[PDB]
Amino acid sequence: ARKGILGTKLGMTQVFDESNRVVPVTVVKAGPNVVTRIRTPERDGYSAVQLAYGEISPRKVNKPLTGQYTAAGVNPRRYLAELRLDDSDAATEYQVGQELTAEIFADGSYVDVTGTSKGKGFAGTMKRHGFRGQGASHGAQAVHRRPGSIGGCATPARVFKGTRMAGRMGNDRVTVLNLLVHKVDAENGVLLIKGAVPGRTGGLVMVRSAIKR
């Protein structure tokens, strides 16, 4: 039931629908994928399928990975990821070496898009966690963006684990739910997905048929 594809975020644009309403879309080049591997419950303990996406010079792949691809009889690709299926294999619907193109999805369906969000570096509490800070005037001394108190007093004489402080922000795995597929352009292998998609332009993206729908 669960359908998946791997692609690249190509940036956003806008289109007008039939109601003459503007629709902001993200162009995802859901390029062709190869299966390259099937996980069976009998052999691995769960049911899933690998997917190979992206072109790469064969000289850029080391001998072990090249051997893994040769075992599947497929030319090496840049990326490799597993699509997890329900705990029932059904022992069907996928063959090693089979091609997956963009029209596994249809117009008007909903998808889940997971990617790697943009990095923000070391971030303060005001950006990272939406703290308020103290005022800009009325005597405040060098605390305009500082966090304030971080605990109680002699009880407990510690800071609780999971207290929100400054640190590295971004580069996370992020899934956006219930995105409407506005158009499936099978000619260019392009999905026009209404909304925003995590990550930078040119980053690896996994598109899955939505489960909440």
Partner RNA sequence: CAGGUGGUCAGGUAGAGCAUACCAAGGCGUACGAGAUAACUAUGGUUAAGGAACUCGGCAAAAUGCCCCCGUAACUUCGGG
Partner RNA sequence: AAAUUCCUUGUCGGGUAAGUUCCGACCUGCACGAAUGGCGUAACGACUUCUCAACUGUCUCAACCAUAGACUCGGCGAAA
Partner RNA sequence: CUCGAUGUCGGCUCGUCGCAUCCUGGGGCUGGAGCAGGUCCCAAGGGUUGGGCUGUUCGCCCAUUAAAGCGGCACGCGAGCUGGGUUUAGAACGUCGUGAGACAGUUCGGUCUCUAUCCGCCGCGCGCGUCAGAAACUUGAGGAAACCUGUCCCUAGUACGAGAGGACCGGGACGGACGAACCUCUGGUGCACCAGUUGUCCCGCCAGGGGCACCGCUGGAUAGCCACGUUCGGUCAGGAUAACCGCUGAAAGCAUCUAAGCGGGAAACCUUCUCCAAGAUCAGGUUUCUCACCCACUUGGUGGGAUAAGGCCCCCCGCAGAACACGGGUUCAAUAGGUCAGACCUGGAAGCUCAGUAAUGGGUGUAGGGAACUGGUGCUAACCGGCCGAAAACUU
For binding to Mg ion (CB under 5 A), which residues are involved? 139, 156-157
Among 38, 49, 83, 192, binds other proteins (CB under 8 A): 192
Our separate counts of H helices and E strands in the chain read 2, 13
Please identify, among the stretches 91-99, 100-108, 153-161, 183-191, the one whose residues bind RNA according to the rule CB under 7 A.
153-161
Coil, strand, or helix at residue 21?
coil
- Report the residue from 5, 6, 27, 85 that binds other proteins according to the rule CB under 8 A: 27
Residue from 1, 14, 136, 156 binding other proteins (CB under 8 A): 14
Q: Which does 15 bind (CB under 5 to 8 A by kind): RNA, other proteins, Mg ion, none?
A: other proteins
Which amino acid is residue 128, in one-letter code?
R
Residue 195: CB atoms within 10 Å: 15
Q: Judged by CB under 8 A, which of 70, 98, 171, 188 binds other proteins?
A: 188
- Cα(200)–Cα(207) distance, integer angstroms: 15
Angle at 112 between CA 108 and CA 118, to 5 degrees: 125
- Residue 11 sits in the site that holds other proteins (CB under 8 A): yes
Helices in the chain by DSSP H: which ranges? 63-72, 125-128
Alpha-carbon torsion 181, 183, 185, 191, what sign? negative
Is residue 15 involved in binding other proteins (CB under 8 A)? yes
Name which position in 155, 190, 191, 192 contacts RNA (CB under 7 A). 155
> In whole angstroms, how close is the CB of 121 to other proteins at the nearest point?
13
Does residue 1 bind RNA (CB under 7 A)?
Answer: no
Q: Is 122 helix (H, G, I), strand (E, B) or coil?
A: strand
